[PDB]
Design a protein around this ligand. Structure first.
Ligand code: HEM
Ligand SMILES: CCCCc1nc(Cl)c(CO)n1Cc1ccc(-c2ccccc2-c2nn[nH]n2)cc1
Ligand SMILES: CCCCc1nc(Cl)c(CO)n1Cc1ccc(-c2ccccc2-c2nn[nH]n2)cc1
Ligand SMILES: [K+]
Length: 464
């Protein structure tokens, strides 16, 4: 038998007993009744939900391979998304994940480190902030250009200028699809309809923008096919073509131009929004808690100084700053239910049997907001990541990137973008709120499977 759960109604399952507004709250509520493991029916489709650290750890880590599948919904087909990493499964996934992990190492693509690409961008990020001349500002756009430009660098061997139109178009389309995909209507409600697509227009728009991006990725690929030093692959494309020119006798292969571009779109998709929002939300949290902003800056002044830009080495000699970044990610809880998983085979899990294919909903919130581990888990406090001596305190419950075999491919790159961009900003700027901190409110605004910070403006005031 499958786990227990609230008895569904005929043909709509448990649809109307789940608050579509704040799903994570609804799942947590259900846990208080049915426990750490439970089933919901999303219209005859069962969904096992894991909730709390113990359940999540033993599914995702202890039974990693079994829980390594990606849950597929109709939106996967309508927006054609199962051909890269994020939404692929089986071999296709195993191979492309692995290649991408290797390639995304810090020195996986030649002499230029990932870290050097990020530092170059942190520089430019700082420079744009200057161009705002200390006037009010909605950092949404600027802060999103950086993580996007890092992906551009990783994929095409170098960055764009923030006013280059090719870049602006790329970003526009990315930003459009992300906002579209964030609608409850597309993420949830259209998924109730397994065959008929009630938003054909929207999917058409989504695909039209993917194609624009794909077509650009092809213009670059071709160019890389005539700048090809086989001994110095300078970016993700070179590395991919290399792997292609080495599987020529293993047709058919997972590595083709089709998969390269699908994978590149996955990187753009996964790489810019969440990093971008996390930065935006970090600023808002620093504005609200200026004692924190000040202590990070003490660390920056003492360890880094002004004669140079920050590097990843500094991180180990900057426990307060490390705690702050960690606390931002834990508090904001951006993907409260990760990405749905699926089991790969028939699996006994605790008391119950879960059939192969069954969708699995991991509650990251449950872990990140565990109160034994993080007392007062609803209130931003770097102290959650600090021992009584002021050293950094690791946590098994730090899973903003999820856990196990499907853990964020970008874990390290994100942490590098979070640590470098924030230290770089706080190194050269002080932050002023337009309105008084007292009435700012940084509570997450939550809409389906997405947390987001509330609109705010601020001034980037230069120091020294
Ligand atoms: C603050 C930043 C980020 C957060 C919080 C985050 C979080 C996540 C989460 C929760 C997942 C779902 C994992 C799962 O299915 O269990 C995921 C998947 C993924 N992330 Fe990120 N991520 C971030 C940044 C990035 C960046 C910069 C990249 C750049 C390469 C990236 C690439 C991916 C990829 C490729 C996947 C799909 C992994 C797979 O299914 O095999 N992420 N991320
Ligand atoms: C299939 C032929 C048209 C496709 C399409 N490509 C683009 Cl570009 C546009 C921009 O609005 N569009 C049209 C489009 C029209 C309606 C929506 C939409 C907006 C809000 C609420 C429902 C809809 C909708 N989606 N599908 N049908 N109606 C989205 C995109
Ligand atoms: C111009 C192209 C814009 C990017 C975008 N539009 C479309 Cl449609 C795809 C579908 O794969 N993509 C790529 C896409 C890939 C993965 C995700 C995903 C990755 C990690 C965490 C959440 C996201 C998510 N899924 N749905 N919305 N955002 C987002 C976008
Ligand atoms: K239409």
């Amino acid at each position: 038998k499958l786990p227990p759960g609230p008895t569904p109604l005929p043909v709509i399952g448990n649809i109307l007993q789940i608050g579509i507004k704040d799903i994570s709250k609804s799942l947590t509520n259900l846990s208080k009744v049915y426990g750490p493991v439970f089933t919901l029916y999303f219209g005859l489709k069962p969904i096992v939900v894991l909730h709390g650290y113990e359940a999540v750890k033993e599914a995702l880590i202890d039974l990693g391979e079994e829980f390594s599948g990606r849950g597929i919904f109709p939106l996967a087909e309508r927006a054609n998304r199962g051909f890269g990493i994020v939404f692929s499964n089986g071999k296709k996934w195993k191979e492309i994940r692995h290649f991408s992990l290797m390639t995304l190492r810090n020195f996986g693509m030649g002499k230029r480190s990932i870290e050097d690409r990020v530092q170059e961008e942190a520089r430019c990020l700082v420079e744009e902030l200057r161009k705002t001349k200390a006037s009010p500002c909605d950092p949404t756009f600027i802060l999103g250009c950086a993580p996007c430009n890092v992906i551009c660098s990783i994929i095409f061997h170098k960055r764009f200028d923030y006013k280059d139109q090719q870049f602006l178009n790329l970003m526009e389309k990315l930003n459009e699809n992300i906002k579209i995909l964030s609608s409850p209507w597309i993420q949830i409600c259209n998924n109730f309809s397994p065959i008929i697509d009630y938003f054909p227009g929207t999917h058409n728009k989504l695909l039209k923008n993917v194609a624009f991006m794909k077509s650009y990725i092809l213009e670059k690929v071709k160019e890389h096919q005539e700048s090809m030093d086989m001994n110095n692959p300078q970016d993700f494309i070179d590395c991919f073509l290399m792997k292609m020119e080495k599987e020529k006798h293993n047709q058919p292969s997972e590595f083709t131009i089709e998969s390269l571009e699908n994978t590149a779109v996955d990187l753009f998709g996964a790489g810019t929004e969440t990093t971008s929002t996390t930065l935006r939300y970090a600023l808002l949290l620093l504005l609200k808690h200026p004692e924190v902003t000040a202590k990070v800056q003490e660390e920056i002044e003492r360890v880094i100084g002004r004669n140079r830009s920050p590097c990843m080495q500094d991180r180990s000699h900057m426990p307060y700053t490390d705690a702050v970044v960690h606390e931002v990610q834990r508090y904001i809880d951006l993907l409260p239910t990760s990405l749905p998983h699926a089991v790969t085979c028939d699996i006994k899990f605790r008391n119950y049997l879960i059939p192969k294919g069954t969708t699995i909903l991991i509650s990251l919130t449950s872990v990140l907001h565990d109160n034994k581990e993080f007392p007062n888990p609803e209130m931003f406090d770097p102290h959650h990541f600090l021992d009584e001596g002021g050293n950094f305190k690791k946590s098994k419950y730090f899973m903003p990137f999820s856990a196990g075999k499907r853990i964020c491919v970008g874990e390290a790159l994100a942490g590098m973008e979070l640590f470098l961009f924030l230290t770089s900003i706080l190194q050269n700027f002080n932050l002023k709120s337009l309105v008084d901190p007292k009435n700012l409110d940084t509570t997450p605004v939550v809409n389906g499977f997405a947390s987001v910070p509330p609109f705010y403006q601020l001034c980037f005031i230069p120091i020294h």
